[PDB]
Amino acid sequence: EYELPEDPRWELPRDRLVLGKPLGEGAFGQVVLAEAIGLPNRVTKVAVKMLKSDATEKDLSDLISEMEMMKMIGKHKNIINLLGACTQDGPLYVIVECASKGNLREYLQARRPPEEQLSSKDLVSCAYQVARGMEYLASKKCIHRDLAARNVLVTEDNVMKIADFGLARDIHHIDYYKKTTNGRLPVKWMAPEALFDRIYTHQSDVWSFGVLLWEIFTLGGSPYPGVPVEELFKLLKEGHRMDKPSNCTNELYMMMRDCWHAVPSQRPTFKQLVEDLDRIVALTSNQE
Ligand SMILES: */C=C\C(=O)Nc1ccccc1Nc1cc(N(CCCN2CCN(C)CC2)C(=O)Nc2c(Cl)c(OC)cc(OC)c2Cl)ncn1
């Protein structure tokens, strides 16, 4: 861990990083808030990923892989960008953009009606920005595999930023019954070919994006509440599709249903979703 080669254009001297509050423990790393001086005399709030106290040699390898993948993908306004690393004279820190308004599920839930209310235009605009993020990632051949409002973060200026996109495919033993911190099952966002045949593509991320649209328009609603894994598989095998949320146009509902085509080749692309959402935003009212 203290024997890592430097990548000089990314390297930040450790003493320029003021560590702050821990956000607790992830799968192979952990995240702490911090402030970074420079990136000259200016502080930027950042989030930092580092190793757990009890950390395997594979954890270290995974943390490095995620960093290097972030470098290869490059920057975009609608993703959480790599800003820096500390690789020398101490523990590995991977330093990213900090999004101050939490994840999109929380952002949306906090702005449900009885401060800050979201207009219909604001909701379509979150969708647009996520789609744009995902279009960028798709153009870099990055398949997300867990696209969901939980993995979108919102900046101080209400920008949407896709998170957690730099993970290499797990040599798949994915545990279907594992829940999120908030008690929900990630299997509920997965395309059926992903769930049943373990095939993940841009097309399967477009299915996940449809569930994300439904989350946006339910203001952080929970898909399939109270449905366990076995019953979810049966709903999918039957061709069940979630109901149209209230306060969602027929057009946005058709976009969801199109994202949820049984035939992956027949779903829209993110390129097509970006275009449609661009047109829809312009036509959607900000008056309520
Ligand atoms: C900028 C102000 C601020 O304090 N923001 C803030 C406070 C509290 C909670 C979240 C945030 N915003 C934020 C967080 C992150 N994280 C942490 C997201 C929440 N954790 C998920 C993991 N769980 C184990 C703890 C809770 C984040 O992980 N960022 C992140 C890192 Cl560190 C990363 O390292 C390589 C790679 C990615 O994505 C590729 C991300 Cl998203 N990030 C930004 N703002």
Side-chain angles (χ1 to χ4, degrees), residues 130-145:
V130 175
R132 256 214 157 167
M134 288 305 305
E135 183 197 37
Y136 177 75
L137 293 180
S139 77
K140 293 298 205 261
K141 277 57 185 285
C142 169
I143 301 148
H144 190 292
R145 305 182 183 82

Side-chain angles (χ1 to χ4, degrees), residues 169-186:
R169 182 82 193 249
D170 205 334
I171 316 311
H172 74 308
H173 297 90
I174 197 66
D175 177 19
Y176 288 165
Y177 301 89
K178 163 67 114 270
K179 301 184 168 195
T180 63
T181 285
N182 195 41
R184 304 185 183 170
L185 291 157

Side-chain angles (χ1 to χ4, degrees), residues 21-34 45-50 63 66-67 70 79-82 93-103 106 144 150-151 153-156 161-167 181:
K21 275 125 182 182
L23 304 183
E25 178 203 276
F28 64 82
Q30 78 143 137
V31 175
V32 307
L33 277 13
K45 299 196 209 310
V46 299
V48 179
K49 194 181 280 199
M50 69 188 66
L63 180 53
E66 189 186 11
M67 191 177 50
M70 288 179 82
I79 77 186
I80 291 291
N81 298 291
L82 184 65
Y93 298 155
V94 181
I95 306 171
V96 310
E97 292 171 332
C98 186
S100 67
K101 298 186 166 165
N103 80 49
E106 302 172 315
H144 190 292
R150 63 182 163 273
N151 289 319
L153 310 168
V154 185
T155 64
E156 186 53 30
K161 289 178 168 302
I162 296 147
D164 233 284
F165 60 83
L167 274 8
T181 285

Side-chain angles (χ1 to χ4, degrees), residues 81-92:
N81 298 291
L82 184 65
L83 296 171
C86 306
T87 69
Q88 296 305 298
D89 311 326
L92 172 62

Side-chain angles (χ1 to χ4, degrees), residues 225-237:
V227 173
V229 172
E230 282 183 327
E231 297 297 326
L232 170 75
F233 297 161
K234 186 183 163 148
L235 293 182
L236 297 172
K237 285 279 139 76

Side-chain angles (χ1 to χ4, degrees), residues 277-288:
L277 281 167
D278 191 49
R279 182 187 38 85
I280 289 167
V281 165
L283 302 176
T284 295
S285 175
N286 66 180
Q287 294 314 96
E288 79 197 78

Side-chain angles (χ1 to χ4, degrees), residues 215-226:
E215 293 180 275
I216 287 157
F217 294 104
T218 58
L219 301 186
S222 173
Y224 297 128

Side-chain angles (χ1 to χ4, degrees), residues 189-197 199-244:
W189 284 256
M190 302 180 30
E193 65 280 7
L195 203 58
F196 304 125
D197 310 317
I199 297 162
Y200 287 86
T201 61
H202 304 303
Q203 304 145 331
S204 68
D205 277 353
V206 161
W207 174 294
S208 308
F209 182 80
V211 176
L212 197 158
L213 294 167
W214 186 95
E215 293 180 275
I216 287 157
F217 294 104
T218 58
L219 301 186
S222 173
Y224 297 128
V227 173
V229 172
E230 282 183 327
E231 297 297 326
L232 170 75
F233 297 161
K234 186 183 163 148
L235 293 182
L236 297 172
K237 285 279 139 76
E238 290 171 351
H240 190 261
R241 296 293 183 271
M242 287 180 299
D243 296 331
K244 181 178 173 203

